[PDB]
Amino acid sequence: RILPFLGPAVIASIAYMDPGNFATNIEGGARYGYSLLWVILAANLMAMVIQNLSANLGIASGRNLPELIRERWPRPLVWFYWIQAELVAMATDLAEFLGAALAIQLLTGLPMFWGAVVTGVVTFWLLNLQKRGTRPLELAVGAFVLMIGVAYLVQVVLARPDLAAVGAGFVPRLQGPGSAYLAVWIIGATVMPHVIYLHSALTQGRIQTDTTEEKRRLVRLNRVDVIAAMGLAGLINMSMLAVAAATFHGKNVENAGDLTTAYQTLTPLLGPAASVLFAVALLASGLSSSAVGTMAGDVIMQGFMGFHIPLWLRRLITMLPAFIVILLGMDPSSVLILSQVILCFGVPFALVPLLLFTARRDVMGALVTRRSFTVIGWVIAVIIIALNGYLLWELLGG
Ligand SMILES: [Mn+2]
Ligand SMILES: [Mn+2]
């Protein structure tokens, strides 16, 4: 037990490598080269602070975020919070589900429907682990993170990127209205609200404590786990950018956000082996982030309302929007706009209570978050909310 909270940290980090980030990072590389690497880095650092504040809420108060809302806020407001939190968990799981089904299509050739059934069944077995023991799930998610990191490591060696061109991409410079829009879309759609509630419960009561000094030691050993777990997610997101830029930018490639076109152009440029590592890495990202999304939903309802439904019933409900899109044949860009609108709704409603309760001695006791870290959480919050509000102005304006 050298790293006590490494499990919850790896569980929370997988939501920031979901297939939603694959489509964004690839599109940024082909259209603008490496010149967007600074945006990927900026979004990852902001996601480390928010996820660290959730884990501390559970360690200090001995209670998770949905529990404290039920206990302190009025019943009319609590019922609304449970409602919107379920809708966001279903919105973010849609992209994690469809991505896991697309990777199977690139590796085997199966249609999107049968790919979704394969991912639906394997996600059962992942949450089947955490039923009796929560540690087997922490080992499984960690194993999937090992494959995505190794797969994109070989793609960098094969792509042979110009280091001088990669370095110039970390300079915050943007040209043309297209590149600016794509950067705003990264920072606006990065933080995962469903994993904000979940991280608090995973660390809540993980180590029994009778004093306040042993809880404080748990906070220090937890931060290293979050930084290491969230840090690895950032380097992976930058690898997707570099490979797409080192191969597609100078060759005039259109429709880069679609993971199918990016998969086909890797063979004549890099080779057939470069395409396999891409799809294998996309598969481990999808089903891992989908199984975490279900465990978050169970915590949301159990804390907000006191009762809970079985896990198999929760997995069944969240799969419903996934199969509907497959049957209707919706545009991949159309589903990323509607799902992010709901994600743009859940972000403000999640960051506000997290920044309030982690700052109240009534909740945290002698482990209140430093006010210097509370203001920066609000500054990061206003930046994200404003960008989301702007993204809603064009998404709801047409
Ligand atoms: Mn994500
Ligand atoms: Mn160029």
Residue numbers in the entry: 39 to 436
Authors' own words:
Transporters of the Nramp (Natural resistance-associated macrophage protein) family import divalent transition metal ions into cells of most organisms. In addition to the physiological substrates Fe2+ and Mn2+, Nramps can also transport toxic metals like Cd2+ and Hg2+ but exclude the abundant alkaline earth metals like Mg2+ and Ca2+. Recent bacterial Nramp structures reveal a LeuT fold, three stable conformations (outward-open, occluded, and inward-open), and identify the metal-binding site residues, including conserved aspartate, asparagine, and methionine residues. We present high-resolution structures of DraNramp in three conformations in both Mn2+-bound and metal-free states, providing the first molecular map of the entire Mn2+ transport cycle.
We also determined high-resolution DraNramp structures in metal-free occluded (WT) and Mn2+-bound inward-open (M230A•Mn2+) states and re-refined a Mn2+-bound outward-open conformation (G223W•Mn2+). Re-refined G223W•Mn2+ has six Mn2+-coordinating ligands: D56, N59, M230, carbonyl of A53 and two waters; the overall geometry resembles a distorted octahedron as in the occluded structure. A227 replaces a water of the outward-open Mn2+-coordination sphere, thus retaining a six-coordination geometry in both conformations. In the occluded and inward-open conformations, Q378 interacts with two waters, one coordinating the orthosteric Mn2+ and the other interacting with D56 and the carbonyl of T130. This network is disrupted in the outward-open conformation as Q378 and the rest of TM10 swing outward to open the outer vestibule. In the second network, T228, N275, and N82 interact via a water in the occluded and inward-open states, but not in the outward-open state, where the extended unwound region of TM6a positions T228 farther from the orthosteric site and N275 and N82. In the outward-open state, R244 forms an ion pair with E176 and interacts with the TM1a backbone, as does D263, keeping TM1a and TM5 close and the inner gate closed. A metal ion is present at the external site in all inward-open and occluded metal-bound DraNramp structures, but not outward-open structures, as opening the outer vestibule separates D296 and D369 and disrupts the site. The ITC data for G223W with Mn2+ fits only in a one-site model (Kd=440±15 µM), which we assign to the orthosteric site because the opening of the outer vestibule displaces TM10, disrupting the external site. Mn2+ binds at the orthosteric site in G223W, but Cd2+ binding is impaired.
